[PDB]
From a paper:
CE clan proteases, specific hydrolases for ubiquitin-like modifications (SUMO and NEDD8) in eukaryotes, reportedly serve as bacterial effector proteins with deSUMOylase, deubiquitinase, or, even, acetyltransferase activities. Here, we characterize bacterial CE protease activities, revealing K63-linkage-specific deubiquitinases in human pathogens, such as Salmonella, Escherichia, and Shigella, as well as ubiquitin/ubiquitin-like cross-reactive enzymes in Chlamydia, Rickettsia, and Xanthomonas. Five crystal structures, including ubiquitin/ubiquitin-like complexes, explain substrate specificities and redefine relationships across the CE clan. A comparison to the previously determined SENP2-SUMO2 and NEDP1∼NEDD8 complexes (Reverter and Lima, 2004, Reverter et al., 2005, Shen et al., 2005) revealed differences among bacterial CE DUBs in three variable regions (VRs) near the substrate binding (S1) site that were arranged around a structurally conserved helix (constant region, CR).
We determined high-resolution crystal structures of the CE clan effectors SseL, RickCE, and ChlaDUB1. Interestingly, the remaining bacterial effectors SseL, ElaD, and ShiCE are Ub-specific proteases, and ChlaDUB1 and RickCE cleave both Ub- and, to a lesser extent, NEDD8-modified peptides. Like NEDP1, ChlaDUB1 can remove the C-terminal five amino acids from pro-NEDD8 with peptidase activity, but does not cleave the regulatory NEDD8 modification from the cullin RING ligase adaptor Cul1. A corresponding VR-1 region is absent in ChlaDUB1; interestingly, the ChlaDUB1 C terminus occupies this space instead. NEDP1 and ChlaDUB1 contain an insertion of 7 and 24 residues, respectively, in what is a short β-turn in the other structures. In contrast, ChlaDUB1 forms a helix that may serve a similar purpose in recognition of the Ub C terminus. Matching their specificity profiles, ChlaDUB1 and RickCE can both form covalent adducts with Ub and NEDD8 suicide probes. Deletion of the inserted VR-3 helix of ChlaDUB1 or the predicted VR-1 outside the crystallized boundaries of RickCE resulted in a total loss in recognition of the Ub/Ubl probes. The Ub/NEDD8 cross-reactive enzymes ChlaDUB1 and RickCE fall into their own clade.
Numbering used by the authors: 136 to 401
Amino acid sequence: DLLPLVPEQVFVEMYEDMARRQTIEALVPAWDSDIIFKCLCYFHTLYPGLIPLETFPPATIFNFKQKIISILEDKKAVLRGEPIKGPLPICCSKENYRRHLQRTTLLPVFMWYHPTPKTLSDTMQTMKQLAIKGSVGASHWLLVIVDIQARRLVYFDSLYNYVMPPENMKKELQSFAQQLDQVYPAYDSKKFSVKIAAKEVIQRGSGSSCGAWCCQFLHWYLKDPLTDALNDLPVDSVERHENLASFVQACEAAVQDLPELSWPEA
């Protein structure tokens, strides 16, 4: 039997997939902690209810719940004229921080995650290693929105199930939600609800657009806390990211002439 032709193009069978991924990677490069923070400061000017929490160092899977509880307990104190006990931000005066706490209705909690580290310190160490070599690697940004006004926790994973299956995260967040009912109780005894935002992979074809996706979802949520934008997405991976690219470009222009490393006034 005649031998099959083996072409003198080692990668040709992957050309289409490679071209799409290269296109996507070029459209939306990685967003790290500093630009995310600038974007949050900008978002606050548009939506005063959003407190621009610092992403340095970012929360992790090991301490995001403790960080949220500290912030809410401090907000409770501020509304009662009592001392705050939580760690203070670097780029904000303590007085301005108190005013942000008094005003905020929504905590944008960005979590930086990597499969390998098993502790908070290991995670920070991994974060440092990757940063100096300029690699994303297997790291991933996640967003937890604590909507105080609606008593809603929204979990956004652009890779859908990168940390754990969505039902396992649902379970963990549901237990956390009832802890928040005791920590930050409501007059009418309305319970904190939990929403897993992503029903499938949004970030198809990319290893770097996670940061931008989180900020885009947040902005969609800020425009409409009932948004179904994740369902109205284009099917094509490339089209999704060229829409995201316009968002990114608009944001980067919007913050270009905004003050560096400083919170806006509450």
